[PDB]
Amino acid sequence: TVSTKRSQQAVIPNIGYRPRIRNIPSRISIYWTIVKPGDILLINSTGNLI
Amino acid sequence: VPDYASLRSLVASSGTLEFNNESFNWTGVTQNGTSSACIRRSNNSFFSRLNWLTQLNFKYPALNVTMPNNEQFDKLYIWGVHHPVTDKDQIFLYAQSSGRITVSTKRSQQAVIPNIGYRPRIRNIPSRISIYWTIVKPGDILLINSTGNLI
Amino acid sequence: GRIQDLEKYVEDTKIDLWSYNAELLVALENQHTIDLTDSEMNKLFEKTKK
Ligand SMILES: *[C@@H]1O[C@H](CO)[C@@H](O[C@@H]2O[C@H](CO)[C@@H](O[C@@H]3O[C@H](CO)[C@@H](O)[C@H](O)[C@@H]3O)[C@H](O)[C@H]2NC(C)=O)[C@H](O)[C@H]1NC(C)=O
Ligand SMILES: *[C@@H]1O[C@H](CO)[C@@H](O[C@@H]2O[C@H](CO)[C@@H](O[C@@H]3O[C@H](CO)[C@@H](O)[C@H](O)[C@@H]3O)[C@H](O)[C@H]2NC(C)=O)[C@H](O)[C@H]1NC(C)=O
Numbered sequence: 427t428v429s430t431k432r433s434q435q436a437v438i439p440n441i442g443y444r445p446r447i448r449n450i451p452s453r454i455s456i457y458w459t460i461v462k463p464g465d466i467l468l469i470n471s472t473g474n475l476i
Numbered sequence: 477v478p479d480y481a482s483l484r485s486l487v488a489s490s491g492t493l494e495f496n497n498e499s500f501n502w503t504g505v506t507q508n509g510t511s512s513a514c515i516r517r518s519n520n521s522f523f524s525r526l527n528w529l530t531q532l533n534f535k536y537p538a539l540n541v542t543m544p545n546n547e548q549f550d551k552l553y554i555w556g557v558h559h560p561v562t563d564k565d566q567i568f569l570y571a572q573s574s575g576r577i578t579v580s581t582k583r584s585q586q587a588v589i590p591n592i593g594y595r596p597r598i599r600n601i602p603s604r605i606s607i608y609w610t611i612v613k614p615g616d617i618l619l620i621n622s623t624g625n626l627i
Numbered sequence: 628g629r630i631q632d633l634e635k636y637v638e639d640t641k642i643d644l645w646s647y648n649a650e651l652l653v654a655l656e657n658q659h660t661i662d663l664t665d666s667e668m669n670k671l672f673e674k675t676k677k
């Protein structure tokens with residue numbers, strides 16, 4: 427879970443055997459959170475977090 | 477069809493409906509699943525191009541399957557996800573409560589969780605089918621991992 | 628899919644409109660110049676005769 431005062435985003439990891447580009451069975455999902463000033467973005471996690 | 481308008485437009489943009497069979501290593505599955513919902517030759521049936529999968533013998537091995545595309549043309553694959561109505565319906569169809577689907581390419585991936593839900597019955601059917609479409613480029617391996625619920 | 632389809636539309640829209648638009652601009656000026664040249668010929672012609 428990530429959030430701002432003005433927006434929020436949360437994603438569940440989907441444990442999966444995807445095909446092995448460069449002998450790697452895994453991927454990385456990339457998102458982007460903009461923050462305005464006077465906002466305090468926080469990142470609650472259980473792991474899996476880059 | 478989540479993003480119905482898009483898929484429709486794409487198939488429309490193709491201008492062809494040429495289809496080829498493929499023998500996947502669908503194993504330990506009760507396939508060729510039927511429903512009185514769909515009637516063909518006054519019989520319980522399903523969709524033409526698609527395959528419904530059910531458990532064999534109160535058991536379901538997870539389906540770890542691939543397809544190469546060694547050819548000089550893109551393959552447009554169509555599959556779906558069943559939406560079982562009850563926990564009792566769930567164990568009857570797929571013999572394992574937790575449903576999960578993963579499909580991927582080398583260049584993109586998609587995964588969807590089935591949402592067990594009581595829905596309004598169009599044509600006396602409490603369930604639906606969610607339809608997605610995965611394009612594959614050549615030299616890619618469309619692979620599917622599943623726990624069930626897979627069309 | 629759908630999104631991509633619409634900006635292909637937007638693109639073709641612009642190019643078509645501009646293409647025709649430019650086509651007219653060009654043709655209108657060509658006429659104008661040819662008019663202005665021979666009109667000045669006529670104007671010099673008149674100046675002499677007058
Ligand atoms: C991707 O495909 C593979 C296919 O081999 C899946 O691996 C197998 O998945 C099961 C998940 O239940 C693993 O656990 C097993 O559970 C049963 C009953 O709950 C139990 O009898 C077994 O002893 C075992 O604990 C299993 O280890 C694993 N491999 C084998 C050898 O069957 C994988 O789950 C798929 N990934 C997905 C769909 O997320
Ligand atoms: C189902 O699961 C099997 C095994 O649990 C998977 O097989 C693996 O698939 C990858 C490509 O998808 C292959 O990797 C290759 O490994 C060899 C030997 O380490 C290496 O020389 C190659 O460079 C390449 O990285 C390989 O076939 C296999 N890997 C291993 C060692 O398990 C597979 O993804 C799934 N297959 C099906 C039938 O869907």
Ligand SMILES: *[C@@H]1O[C@H](CO)[C@@H](O[C@@H]2O[C@H](CO)[C@@H](O)[C@H](O)[C@H]2NC(C)=O)[C@H](O)[C@H]1NC(C)=O
Pocket residue numbers: 497502507508527
């Ligand atoms: C379902 O049963 C039939 C029994 O004949 C299997 O065979 C195929 O039937 C379809 C029409 O339903 C034909 O288009 C194919 O030509 C048949 N296969 C072959 C190899 O000739 C069918 O495969 C079964 N379903 C599965 C295993 O998915």
